[PDB]
Structure 1
Amino acid sequence: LAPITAPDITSICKDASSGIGNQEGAIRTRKCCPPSLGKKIKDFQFPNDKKVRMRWPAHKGTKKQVDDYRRAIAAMRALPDDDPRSFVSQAKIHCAYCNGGYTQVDSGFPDIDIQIHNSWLFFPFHRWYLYFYERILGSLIDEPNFALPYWKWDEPKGMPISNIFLGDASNPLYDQYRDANHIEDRIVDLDYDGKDKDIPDQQQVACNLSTVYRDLVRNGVDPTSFFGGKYVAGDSPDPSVGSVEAGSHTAVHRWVGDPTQPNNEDMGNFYSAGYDPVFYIHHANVDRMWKLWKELRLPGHVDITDPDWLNASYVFYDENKDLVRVYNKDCVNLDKLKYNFIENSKEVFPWRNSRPPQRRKSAQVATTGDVKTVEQTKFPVRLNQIFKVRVKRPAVNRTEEEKDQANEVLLIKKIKYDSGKFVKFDVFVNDKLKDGVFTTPCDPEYAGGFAQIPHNDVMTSTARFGLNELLEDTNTEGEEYATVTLVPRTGCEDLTVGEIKIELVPIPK
């Protein structure tokens, strides 16, 4: 067993040096280390809160919920910087853990950094991060039952940035370093690639709902595909990045960050994202997606039970300025963490049925055209342009019972690129429409994207796309090969793909 283990973050820490493409021009500090107060690290104890903290949609808060949240951020902003509870200290936590603050010295690897992103540590780390953040905010205003808002971008009216975050600096929830084009009641683009789409609001809303369905159902088919790939001590730069992390979560980061800043600060980069209050509220909904993913009660939607994940741990300051070590295993049950999320109390999530519409055969031509197979192709391949290839399937016309027991999964492995820049490419499968056919940004042929916030230690990544639905949706369940189109969107000039294949992945019970 070799679980990732944060060191004494007050003894072992160094300025952030990873994932920041323009350090010279950086708007925020790279000195992201937490203050040293001489505290001894204590083990986590489950909270004894009387009530469950009920996190609320940021666009539908009561006057008290908004005022308390505003009042708490104000108090946090007033704290001396060196206070571990301060506005700046809380932002630096993200920078320390995401941009090279710590090493794996406690595991016996002092020359390897810890990265909690692009791995199965993604969800539980941010869960713990927010747990303490919330409890700190509550303490500052003496509200024992204080709860964060969440950015419900899975709800149409929750998709624009809530107006509680807007205005000027007289509003504590305001951040000047945001994309000026995206703060004027504009609808978030959950599959943003750095350029505004020119599409009707109704269509952006519909595709956003399809993005949530894609991240949580179409591609989030099991723990590996949803949480991200296995990451243990000794592992130096990926593992595979999860569906939410490389999907809606990354899109929102780049959508909010100010593209006129050198690293698209604040939200556009891990090192600066925490200086925007909306960052935590975005991640509050990401945290909620883990809960929703379980609540779907679909096969494969189970929590990780690998000891190497369960026993991984981080260290945070709490509201008492004590150092607390927390483990992944202790954050899986929200009841025990004494918070949850106000839900709609309706039959269904608004995105629950946003599976792309079935492609009509009348809209398709016979074949995907003249295209070579993976075996006829020389890898690696460069994505300086669109790349198409036929991938051998492990089987054709699988039964519902077989599809119920294993996901057919497209693997794009050995994705090599400079990660000093934001990267995105899109993936389409069995695209073969007749000329003239109406298309949208969320057609059934669209498998999703690979999107990566900068995290240069070149870097090597892996993406996993679910095909059980898509092959049905494109009428290609009987075809021996599946035709894969990779479409570069940004940062792919130097990017290389080393392996492409399709596998049957048994659904874990």
Structure 2
Amino acid sequence: APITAPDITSICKDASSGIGNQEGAIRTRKCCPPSLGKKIKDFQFPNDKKVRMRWPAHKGTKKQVDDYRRAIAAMRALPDDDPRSFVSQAKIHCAYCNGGYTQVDSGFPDIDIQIHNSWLFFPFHRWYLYFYERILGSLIDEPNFALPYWKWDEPKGMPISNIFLGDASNPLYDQYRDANHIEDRIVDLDYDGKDKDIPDQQQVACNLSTVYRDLVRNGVDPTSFFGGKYVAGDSPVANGDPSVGSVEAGSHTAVHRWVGDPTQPNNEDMGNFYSAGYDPVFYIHHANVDRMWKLWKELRLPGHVDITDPDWLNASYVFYDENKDLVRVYNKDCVNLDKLKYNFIEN
């Protein structure tokens, strides 16, 4: 039976798993979404007249960068208890990744829902971003709004984009980042918690190698790429478990560890799930992870196929949308980007 989110606005508990230092935690663990007594409605495919074209974060136009900053600022300006707010959007990640919900709707109220470290990883984050992007557009009255994506698979895209830097006056800034790494600028997709101290050009080569390993060498079939089968009745898979998919365990994890500030108790913000969403770059990194799924499929290789297991197809999550409606979405319905009315500008 498929993993099924309950009414997250009626059945939710404080996040208390996967956070090593709760005593000194700098972000809240009260990550439950606002309870507005709304009815959960089924997803309907968008009727957008144009496709939203996500743009490389290092090659944005003035309007792209300006619109994005304005949208994030608007989001930061909302009171937290607005489900579209900066903090509410961050808490979504906390609730789904750090044990806010249980499998009660599947008859297992004794077991948490975890969307990480399994085949739920890609589709959950695809939906998370889908609503996030549409919410941002609505806040600035831009019906064709699109997120940037951090193109760390291309050399010019490997340095963290300057648009995220500066100080608090920049809405895309977050003080809780590894200061030494931000100075280095170039992300280490092979980062394992220890600085390599290698030449920049060698880091580029290392990063190109890492993307190849995650998309081709190790992502050879649906189980190795998406991650292990995870269904109702299953306990949460531990971080670093061998069954975790190639991208999630590889380049994905590396970027989070690299950006997260090691002087913080849980390496907040990016260094832990529960706090990652408080860094705007979280969503932009994840937009490229979302793109990795597209690239993996476009590689017409044996085994590079989508999942057909019903217990994956029928897994579902709940999100607030731009109208503050509650929407249930299914994995099966996000596999086709044309139907979600967005794509990525390549090069």
Q: Same fold (TM over 0.5)?
A: yes
Find the aligned partners of 1:92 and 1:335 in 2 and give their Cα distance. 28
Native 8 Å contact 1:53 1:338 kept in 2? yes
Q: CA offset at residue 180 of structure 1?
A: 0.2
Residue identity over aligned pairs, in percent, reads: 100
Native 8 Å contact 1:119 1:239 kept in 2? no
Find the aligned partners of 1:253 and 1:189 in 2 and give their Cα distance. 10
1:483-505: CA deviation from partner (whole Å, max 9, x where unpaired)? xxxxxxxxxxxxxxxxxxxxxxx
Q: CA offset at residue 342 of structure 1?
A: 0.3
Native 8 Å contact 1:231 1:239 kept in 2? no
Native 8 Å contact 1:274 1:280 kept in 2? yes
1:382-406: CA deviation from partner (whole Å, max 9, x where unpaired)? xxxxxxxxxxxxxxxxxxxxxxxxx
Structure 2 length-normalised TM: 0.98
Q: CA offset at residue 146 of structure 1?
A: 0.1
Native 8 Å contact 1:161 1:185 kept in 2? no
Find the aligned partners of 1:178 and 1:217 in 2 and give their Cα distance. 31
Native 8 Å contact 1:315 1:323 kept in 2? yes
Q: Report the equivalent of 1:300.
A: 303
Native 8 Å contact 1:138 1:147 kept in 2? yes
Q: CA offset at residue 184 of structure 1?
A: 2.0
Native 8 Å contact 1:130 1:280 kept in 2? yes
Find the aligned partners of 1:78 and 1:129 in 2 and give their Cα distance. 21
Find the aligned partners of 1:246 and 1:22 in 2 and give their Cα distance. 22
User: In structure 2, do the counterparts of structure 1 residues 239 and 188 end up closer, same or farther at CA, with 3 Å as the change threshold?
Assistant: closer
Q: Which runs of 5+ in 2 are unaligned?
A: none
Find the aligned partners of 1:178 and 1:51 in 2 and give their Cα distance. 36
Find the aligned partners of 1:85 and 1:186 in 2 and give their Cα distance. 31
User: In structure 2, do the counterparts of structure 1 residues 180 and 239 end up closer, same or farther at CA, with 3 Å as the change threshold?
Assistant: closer
1:139-179: CA deviation from partner (whole Å, max 9, x where unpaired)? 00000000000000001111111000000000000000000
Native 8 Å contact 1:6 1:106 kept in 2? yes
Q: Report the equivalent of 1:266.
A: 269
SS of equivalent to 1:75: helix
1:424-453: CA deviation from partner (whole Å, max 9, x where unpaired)? xxxxxxxxxxxxxxxxxxxxxxxxxxxxxx
Aligned residues: 343
1:242-280: CA deviation from partner (whole Å, max 9, x where unpaired)? 000000000000000000000000000000000000000
Q: CA offset at residue 239 of structure 1?
A: 8.0
SS of equivalent to 2:274: coil
User: In structure 2, do the counterparts of structure 1 residues 325 and 10 end up closer, same or farther at CA, with 3 Å as the change threshold?
Assistant: same
Single out whichever of 42-51 and 189-198 deviates more from structure 2: 189-198
Q: Which has the higher helix share?
A: 2
1:369-391: CA deviation from partner (whole Å, max 9, x where unpaired)? xxxxxxxxxxxxxxxxxxxxxxx
Q: Report the equivalent of 1:217.
A: 216
SS of equivalent to 1:325: strand
User: In structure 2, do the counterparts of structure 1 residues 239 and 329 end up closer, same or farther at CA, with 3 Å as the change threshold?
Assistant: farther
1:192-244: CA deviation from partner (whole Å, max 9, x where unpaired)? 01111021111100110000000000000000000001000011146810000
1:72-115: CA deviation from partner (whole Å, max 9, x where unpaired)? 00000000110000000000000000000000000000010000
Q: Which has the larger radius of gyration?
A: 1
Native 8 Å contact 1:91 1:275 kept in 2? yes
Q: CA offset at residue 311 of structure 1?
A: 0.2
Q: Report the equivalent of 1:82.
A: 81
Find the aligned partners of 1:67 and 1:136 in 2 and give their Cα distance. 16
SS of equivalent to 1:244: helix
1:319-358: CA deviation from partner (whole Å, max 9, x where unpaired)? 00000000000000000000000013xxxxxxxxxxxxxx
Find the aligned partners of 1:198 and 1:58 in 2 and give their Cα distance. 25
Q: CA offset at residue 185 of structure 1?
A: 4.9
Q: CA offset at residue 38 of structure 1?
A: 1.1
User: In structure 2, do the counterparts of structure 1 residues 239 and 113 end up closer, same or farther at CA, with 3 Å as the change threshold?
Assistant: farther
Find the aligned partners of 1:42 and 1:281 in 2 and give their Cα distance. 28
1:448-476: CA deviation from partner (whole Å, max 9, x where unpaired)? xxxxxxxxxxxxxxxxxxxxxxxxxxxxx
Native 8 Å contact 1:266 1:276 kept in 2? yes
SS of equivalent to 1:340: strand
Find the aligned partners of 2:345 and 2:311 in 1 and give their Cα distance. 32
Find the aligned partners of 1:195 and 1:272 in 2 and give their Cα distance. 21
SS of equivalent to 1:316: strand
Find the aligned partners of 2:270 and 2:340 in 1 and give their Cα distance. 27
1:42-66: CA deviation from partner (whole Å, max 9, x where unpaired)? 0000000010000000000000000
Find the aligned partners of 2:7 and 2:323 in 1 and give their Cα distance. 18
The structure showing larger relative contact order (alpha-carbon pairs under 8 Å, at least 6 residues apart) is 2
Q: CA offset at residue 183 of structure 1?
A: 1.2
Native 8 Å contact 1:266 1:272 kept in 2? yes
Q: CA offset at residue 186 of structure 1?
A: 2.2
Native 8 Å contact 1:118 1:239 kept in 2? no
Find the aligned partners of 2:242 and 2:114 in 1 and give their Cα distance. 11
Find the aligned partners of 1:63 and 1:34 in 2 and give their Cα distance. 34
Native 8 Å contact 1:221 1:301 kept in 2? yes
1:281-311: CA deviation from partner (whole Å, max 9, x where unpaired)? 0000000000000001111100000000000
Find the aligned partners of 2:73 and 2:186 in 1 and give their Cα distance. 27
Q: Which has the higher strand share?
A: 1
